[PDB]
Amino acid sequence: MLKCYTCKEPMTSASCRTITRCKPEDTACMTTLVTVEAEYPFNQSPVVTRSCSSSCVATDPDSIGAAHLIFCCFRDLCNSEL
């Protein structure tokens, strides 16, 4: 199945690289790259949240959930970055 480096939940400033198995219907990975930071908890390094997706597309509609950069792919662990 589709495997993407998705962590548990958006809490740790970094170290968000865990091999997670996506759903059978999904065939693409999604990543939210955001350097900006509001208030703690936080760190010197940037923060991102990778999650499974069934349609890799780059578009910033509302971006209310800090969805600035959207990096998606169609390969397991296409990116081994934080």
- Residue 30's contacts (CB-CB under 8 Å, 6 or more residues apart) are 4, 50, 51, 52, 53, 56, 70, 71, 72
**What is the residue type of 82?**
L
Q: What angle do CA 75, 79, 11 make, to 5 degrees?
A: 115
13 close to 47: Cβ distance less than 8 angstroms: yes
Please give the Cα distance from 61 to 12 (Å, whole number): 26
Task: Please state how this structure was obtained.
Answer: NMR
**In sequence order, what are the residues at sequence separation of 6 or more whose Cβ sits closer than 8 angstroms to the Cβ of residue 46?**
13, 14, 33, 34, 35, 82
User: Token digits for 51?
Assistant: 């999650």
End-to-end CA distance of the chain: 21
Q: Facing residues of 29 across strands?
A: 52, 73
Instruction: Count helices and strands (H / E) in the chain.
Output: 0, 5
Cis upstream peptide for 41 (omega within 30°): yes
